[PDB]
Write an enzyme that holds these catalytic residues in place. Structure first.
Site, PDB file in Angstrom:
ATOM      1  N   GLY A  13       8.049   3.023  -2.880  1.00  0.00           N
ATOM      2  CA  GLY A  13       8.285   2.031  -1.993  1.00  0.00           C
ATOM      3  C   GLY A  13       9.610   1.362  -2.369  1.00  0.00           C
ATOM      4  N   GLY A  16       7.935  -0.844  -5.497  1.00  0.00           N
ATOM      5  CA  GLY A  16       7.098  -0.400  -6.124  1.00  0.00           C
ATOM      6  C   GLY A  16       6.290   0.903  -5.664  1.00  0.00           C
ATOM      7  N   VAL A  17       5.303   1.390  -6.285  1.00  0.00           N
ATOM      8  CA  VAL A  17       4.815   2.525  -6.016  1.00  0.00           C
ATOM      9  C   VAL A  17       3.573   2.334  -4.786  1.00  0.00           C
ATOM     10  CG1 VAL A  17       3.723   4.680  -6.714  1.00  0.00           C
ATOM     11  CG2 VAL A  17       5.016   3.426  -8.287  1.00  0.00           C
ATOM     12  N   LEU A  74      -1.460   4.445   7.296  1.00  0.00           N
ATOM     13  CA  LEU A  74      -1.165   5.515   8.521  1.00  0.00           C
ATOM     14  C   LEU A  74      -0.975   6.748   8.066  1.00  0.00           C
ATOM     15  CD1 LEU A  74      -0.155   2.345   9.789  1.00  0.00           C
ATOM     16  CD2 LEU A  74       0.591   3.924  11.841  1.00  0.00           C
ATOM     17  N   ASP A 118      16.051  -1.863   5.730  1.00  0.00           N
ATOM     18  CA  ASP A 118      16.091  -0.446   5.192  1.00  0.00           C
ATOM     19  C   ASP A 118      15.570   0.314   6.119  1.00  0.00           C
ATOM     20  OD1 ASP A 118      17.173   1.399   3.366  1.00  0.00           O
ATOM     21  OD2 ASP A 118      15.746   1.229   1.892  1.00  0.00           O
ATOM     22  N   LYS A 120      14.314   3.544   8.048  1.00  0.00           N
ATOM     23  CA  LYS A 120      14.713   5.081   7.820  1.00  0.00           C
ATOM     24  C   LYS A 120      13.521   5.742   8.288  1.00  0.00           C
ATOM     25  CE  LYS A 120      14.160   4.101   2.866  1.00  0.00           C
ATOM     26  NZ  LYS A 120      14.545   4.769   1.654  1.00  0.00           N
ATOM     27  N   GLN A 122      11.691   7.769   6.871  1.00  0.00           N
ATOM     28  CA  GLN A 122      10.333   7.647   5.919  1.00  0.00           C
ATOM     29  C   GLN A 122       9.647   6.527   5.665  1.00  0.00           C
ATOM     30  OE1 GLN A 122      13.873   8.711   5.510  1.00  0.00           O
ATOM     31  NE2 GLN A 122      14.122   9.129   3.447  1.00  0.00           N
ATOM     32  N   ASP A 136       7.482  -1.280   4.991  1.00  0.00           N
ATOM     33  CA  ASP A 136       8.312  -1.191   3.667  1.00  0.00           C
ATOM     34  C   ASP A 136       9.489  -1.979   3.931  1.00  0.00           C
ATOM     35  OD1 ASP A 136       8.830  -0.492   1.113  1.00  0.00           O
ATOM     36  OD2 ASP A 136       9.093   1.557   1.279  1.00  0.00           O
TER      37      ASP A 136
HETATM   38  C1  LIG Z   1       5.322   8.681   3.007  1.00  0.00           C
HETATM   39  O1  LIG Z   1       4.922   7.283   3.547  1.00  0.00           O
HETATM   40  C2  LIG Z   1       3.517   7.382   4.198  1.00  0.00           C
HETATM   41  C3  LIG Z   1       2.602   8.559   4.827  1.00  0.00           C
HETATM   42  C4  LIG Z   1       1.762   7.719   5.396  1.00  0.00           C
HETATM   43  N1  LIG Z   1       1.627   6.454   5.076  1.00  0.00           N
HETATM   44  C5  LIG Z   1       2.749   6.378   4.369  1.00  0.00           C
HETATM   45  C6  LIG Z   1       3.267   4.815   4.139  1.00  0.00           C
HETATM   46  C7  LIG Z   1       2.440   3.428   4.096  1.00  0.00           C
HETATM   47  C8  LIG Z   1       1.021   3.405   4.960  1.00  0.00           C
HETATM   48  O2  LIG Z   1       0.383   4.346   5.477  1.00  0.00           O
HETATM   49  N2  LIG Z   1       0.989   2.080   4.848  1.00  0.00           N
HETATM   50  C9  LIG Z   1       2.156   1.170   4.312  1.00  0.00           C
HETATM   51  C10 LIG Z   1       2.190   0.013   4.064  1.00  0.00           C
HETATM   52  C11 LIG Z   1       3.260  -0.512   3.438  1.00  0.00           C
HETATM   53  C12 LIG Z   1       4.394   0.600   3.157  1.00  0.00           C
HETATM   54  F1  LIG Z   1       5.452   0.197   2.354  1.00  0.00           F
HETATM   55  C13 LIG Z   1       4.253   1.878   3.194  1.00  0.00           C
HETATM   56  C14 LIG Z   1       5.491   2.825   2.894  1.00  0.00           C
HETATM   57  C15 LIG Z   1       6.274   3.463   2.666  1.00  0.00           C
HETATM   58  C16 LIG Z   1       6.926   4.549   2.043  1.00  0.00           C
HETATM   59  O3  LIG Z   1       8.483   4.103   2.443  1.00  0.00           O
HETATM   60  C17 LIG Z   1       6.899   5.084   0.793  1.00  0.00           C
HETATM   61  N3  LIG Z   1       5.522   4.868  -0.002  1.00  0.00           N
HETATM   62  C18 LIG Z   1       7.399   6.588   0.696  1.00  0.00           C
HETATM   63  C19 LIG Z   1       8.454   6.944   1.915  1.00  0.00           C
HETATM   64  O4  LIG Z   1       7.993   7.022  -0.420  1.00  0.00           O
HETATM   65  C20 LIG Z   1       2.960   2.412   4.027  1.00  0.00           C
END
Ligand SMILES: COc1cc[nH]c1/C=C1\C(=O)Nc2ccc(F)c(C#C[C@@H](O)[C@@H](N)[C@@H](C)O)c21
EC number: 2.7.11.22
Length: 273
Positions: A13, A16-17, A74, A118, A120, A122, A136
């Site tokens: 993110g 963080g991860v 999601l 930010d 995008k 993704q 994010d």
């Molecule tokens: C690849 O990203 C996916 C796919 C399914 N869910 C997500 C992300 C989130 C989700 O379900 N709930 C969240 C709450 C706060 C969040 F910040 C996220 C998020 C995100 C992404 O930007 C990164 N983890 C990836 C792009 O590297 C999500």
């Protein structure tokens, strides 16, 4: 934090991860953001920022030199969906629905002086119900507004509108609008499509921190060349989302009243999970 079982890593993110995780008592499946390290007060305020098109911040766990953010999960992001749709393209009614919902989410954020900063594909999340959500918020340069690239220190909600315009274009054409790989390349790709901005279209531009009188002077391309086969309403809205001057760039609220959204509906996407 011992209340959560890791299911799998989602990705990196902003701070963080993010993991798909399960709550051991309730059985809730969530997205857990582990932040590594007044911010605690800022996040407390973000928890109150609730809207159908913003990913829900469920809980904030401040325990140790450690901060964990428990979010709604999601199943898919827009990039994955775009990638899976690349042979046919996302149907226009679905593009229109997603755009409309994101403009609603942003109008809400923006009314509370909260910017995404930010946006995008993704970090745009979709579900089987036809919903799309901002996530994010609270390096890919492709979606960065030109005022940021030119060194604006105190930029505005207009940055998110620019990013959403680039995403809109990308959903339509199945190609990234401005796929730059450095700041200058990003800036020059924008300049080559939209024309090098001057004081006429963007008053103040030559005064910006990283503006250089020595920037090449490219001409604006024909706009019907940029997003075929988008109809006149779509191209008109897009051009207003991509105005150089942040102050002339359409607001999320005004964009929702654009004639492009006259026939908006909410289709359900076909998601393979
Ligand atoms: C690849 O990203 C996916 C796919 C399914 N869910 C997500 C992300 C989130 C989700 O379900 N709930 C969240 C709450 C706060 C969040 F910040 C996220 C998020 C995100 C992404 O930007 C990164 N983890 C990836 C792009 O590297 C999500």
């Amino acid at each position: 934090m011992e209340n959560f079982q890791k299911v799998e890593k989602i990705g990196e993110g902003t701070y963080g991860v993010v993991y798909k995780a399960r709550n051991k008592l309730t059985g809730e499946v969530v997205a857990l953001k582990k932040i590594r390290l007044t911010a605690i007060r800022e996040i407390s305020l973000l928890k109150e920022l609730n809207h159908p098109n913003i990913v829900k911040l469920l809980d904030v766990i401040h325990t140790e030199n450690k901060l964990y953010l428990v979010f709604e999960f999601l199943h898919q992001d827009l990039k994955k969906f775009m990638d899976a749709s690349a042979l046919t393209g996302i149907p226009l009614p679905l593009i229109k629905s997603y755009l409309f919902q994101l403009l609603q989410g942003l109008a809400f954020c923006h009314s509370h002086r909260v910017l995404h900063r930010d946006l995008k594909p993704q970090n745009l999340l979709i579900n089987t119900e036809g919903a799309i959500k901002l996530a994010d918020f609270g390096v890919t340069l492709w979606y960065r507004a030109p005022e940021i690239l030119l060194g604006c220190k105190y930029y505005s909600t207009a940055v998110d509108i620019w990013s959403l315009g680039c995403i809109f274009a990308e959903m339509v054409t199945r190609r990234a609008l401005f796929p730059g790989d450095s700041e200058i390349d990003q800036l020059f790709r924008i300049f080559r499509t939209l024309g090098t901005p001057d004081e006429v279209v963007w008053p103040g531009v030559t005064s910006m921190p990283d503006y250089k009188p020595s920037f090449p002077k490219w001409a604006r391309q024909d706009f019907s060349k940029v997003v075929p086969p988008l109809d006149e309403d779509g191209r008109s809205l897009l051009s207003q989302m991509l105005h150089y001057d942040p102050n002339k760039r359409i607001s999320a609220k005004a964009a929702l009243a654009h004639p492009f959204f006259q026939d908006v509906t909410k289709p359900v996407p076909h998601l393979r999970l």
